[PDB]
Amino acid sequence: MSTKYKWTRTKIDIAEGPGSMNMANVLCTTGAQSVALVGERAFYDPRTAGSKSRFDDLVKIAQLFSVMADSTTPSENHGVDAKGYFKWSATTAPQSIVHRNIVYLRLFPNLNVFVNSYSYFRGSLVLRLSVYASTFNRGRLRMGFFPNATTDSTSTLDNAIYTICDIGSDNSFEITIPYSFSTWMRKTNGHPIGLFQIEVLNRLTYNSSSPSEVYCIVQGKMGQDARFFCPTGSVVTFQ
Amino acid sequence: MSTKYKWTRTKIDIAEGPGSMNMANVLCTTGAQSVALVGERAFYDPRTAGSKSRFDDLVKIAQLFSVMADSTTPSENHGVDAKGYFKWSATTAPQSIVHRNIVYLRLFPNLNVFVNSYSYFRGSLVLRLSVYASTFNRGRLRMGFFPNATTDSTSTLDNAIYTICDIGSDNSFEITIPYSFSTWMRKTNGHPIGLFQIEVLNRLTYNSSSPSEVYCIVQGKMGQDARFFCPTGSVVTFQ
Amino acid sequence: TMSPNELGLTSAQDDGPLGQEKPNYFLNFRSMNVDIFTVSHTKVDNLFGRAWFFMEHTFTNEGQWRVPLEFPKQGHGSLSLLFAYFTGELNIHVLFLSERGFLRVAHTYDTSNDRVNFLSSNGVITVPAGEQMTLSAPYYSNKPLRTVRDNNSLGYLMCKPFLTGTSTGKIEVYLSLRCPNFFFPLPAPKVT
Amino acid sequence: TMSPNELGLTSAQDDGPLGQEKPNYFLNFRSMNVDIFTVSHTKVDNLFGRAWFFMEHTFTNEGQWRVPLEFPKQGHGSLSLLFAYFTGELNIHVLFLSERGFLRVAHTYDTSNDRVNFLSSNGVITVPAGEQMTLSAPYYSNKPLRTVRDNNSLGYLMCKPFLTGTSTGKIEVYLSLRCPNFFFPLPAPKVT
Amino acid sequence: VDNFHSMAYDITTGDKNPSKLVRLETHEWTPSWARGYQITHVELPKVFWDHQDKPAYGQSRYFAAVRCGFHFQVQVNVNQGTAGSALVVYEPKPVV
RNA sequence: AUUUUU
RNA sequence: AUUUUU
RNA sequence: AUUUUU
RNA sequence: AUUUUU
């Protein structure tokens, strides 16, 4: 029998760090001690929230449209600013610009939050232009996008990813921008997404009882393949 | 039932060293805690490196040729220096020396790195002499090697490990030096590898349109049985 | 095949119900999902499973420290501001910076400031001087859901240090949550 | 039998592709592989699995310590200079030499110096005064590969000590890596 | 598709044209140049669009990103009477 | 990625 | 509530 | 004395 | 030496 050795408790070596508190790994925090009377769990009630289940993934929120650089007043510079709220006017030439600016994720309410949370990301971005005109107004508008472009200057969109918008019943055209960077993952706050330009293709037509100019709204969200990766510090403070 | 004893947590004895950090054993470091959000791993991309797999063993690098005591100018002392870059000249007598010196691992770029990393090693060493002459030049050259020799002096190579080089199409002759020491493992930086001598056997012949002297290059690498053992401190600082 | 709806032509007034994972394509393009890590960093459990600084308190006496715990409008935890209601475990990380003593720590969702005067059963864990602990407070709230914004969205934290001599110090506190249940996402926050 | 090629007679211009494990023989000789230890000390995982000093910082205030981590041109880690690209886990060993306090440690590959101003989710592990920890930072790089030479080949390390009184000290830092992926070996380095 | 092939070439000729082999550089090996001396270099990969007369110059102008493989052929001719040796090596940005 | 160990 | 991990 | 937990 | 516990 093992009576040739005096029974003793197990001896073990304690690794580096005496009471090192890991506040980075979730696998570490979830295992923390419980101040609960019996270390148990509670029964959650989604109904009171009108929901059938909790919200598990945040990416879905990043996939929700939000106005770009939204303002109370339309672009007062013929749309050459970041305001995603401008006017499509009959006067504007068949090639003049109705809106041009460099796009960044932070220009979007929902996205700007992730920008201040995660350090990197990847995936396609979707922009949806909604022109609110009357049933009589007609015309076309081509909106293109030069990925990672930085020179904020009007330029032919023949080689850019563009979408021609013909006014009808569904006046909310979109445009997708596939992930494009020299890396497998890009900074959530660094290099621009590209040059966004919406040029006039065909003057907005009208009649005696219809408006000679209409309002437009530009929204932005993440694609179904969107992802965010490293959480980083904050660059701004919300309220 | 075991209700004859009041249930309690396990008691264990903690070995010597409270937060002793072992920075010597890999089995210790690889088990360190992870600051990762979920303590996970990433998917590496070899393609961007043009490779199909990572590099696992360093010995293979030690098995890559590198010029010995490489210089911009050929040996100005008839090759009696460490320069692995000298000249084979027609004038040199049929027994005169074209190059002689004591060989050390540090005399090789690639190897010198391991010399500054590991403390010991073993295995055969291969030296490859490349004489760059024209298609008309002809002659023979015998290069020998006296293992662990220290007296830097010209001596008959009849008893040394030698290789006779007859100029032809493949003008890059080699020479292997089997592991030779009083130990199963020798200092990476200590006793010389031996005496390396390249004597003239037959005067370099030529003609009206061919050079009367050519350039030679001496490279060195480790054998397929090469091994390195203990990593030690550094004796030099790279850049 | 592909419909014109999935090619960009749609109507903003036909988006309800909320949550339409509609695919968008065009020639030479398709939603490509490529993963870099073995897991997601967007999942609520993972992201929030990582703590973030909250506040610091400098003590001199053995007084008590009562503080309304709330969600951050500052760190990566701000992503919570996108929601309206919360419920679940709460991980509190406390650092007791003191030469010689002990720190009593407790947590409750009870608003009454008298049920805390004693600390009887409010979770009085003990962190010896110069130490730090991570206590996970259960959802002992009297309200099924915690509006995520409230200055007291999270329950109050108590800290009554038991000092021995003239020794004084400071208690830095940071926190995270274990498995969080968020509901009814609201509009994105503004910046200061 | 043995060809003249394997007897020393070869041509340097016929070595490509790179990596030719050609055997070399002569009478009374053959490649003899004899092992002294149960395992290899040449394997990248093993060699680099052992740390090496990096640098030391002497703190006086609660300021932060930002430092571009890079491969050594000094210790056995120099063997890395033989490669061009790296990728994989990074083991950071930090020693907090202080009388009374705490040391916040974090790591990121992000070049921006503002994403670190807070330390929200950059891995703020806590080493109590007079203690030492070994944190393994994942490859949270925005670049698939890390040129091995860059003054910031390895991501930046952050150290914001949380002191309590006039106490001051120094933070010595050394490091190693877990399973390293090196690619495209370049020419050997020069000496100073 | 012209069934008569009035143009006898592969249908994908124009497509592959930019990958065509081209002369990237031609410098003269000036005698009396010590070992290690750099004979000539070549800006990779922008050299394939070195001049507007490069097959790849056309397309290269409409795209900002590139991912490609190379196949070099350094040629050096010298009469039999003469001798010498040159080191043709590829140096990634890290090395350069 | 038996890229902790067999 | 595979609401620690598979 | 499932008078640690199932 | 069920001379740790059953």
UniProtKB/Swiss-Prot annotation, chains A, B:
It comes from the Viruses. It is found in: Virion; Host cytoplasm. The N-terminus binds RNA. Interacts with capsid protein VP0 and capsid protein VP1 to form heterotrimeric protomers. Five protomers subsequently associate to form pentamers which serve as building blocks for the capsid. Forms an icosahedral capsid of pseudo T=3 symmetry together with capsid proteins VP0 and VP1. The capsid is 300 Angstroms in diameter, composed of 60 copies of each capsid protein and enclosing the viral positive strand RNA genome. Capsid proteins interact with host alpha-V/beta-3 integrin heterodimer to provide virion attachment target cell. This attachment induces virion internalization predominantly through clathrin-mediated endocytosis. Binds packaging signals present in the viral RNA. This is Capsid protein VP3. The chain holds residues 304 to 542 of 2180 of the full protein.
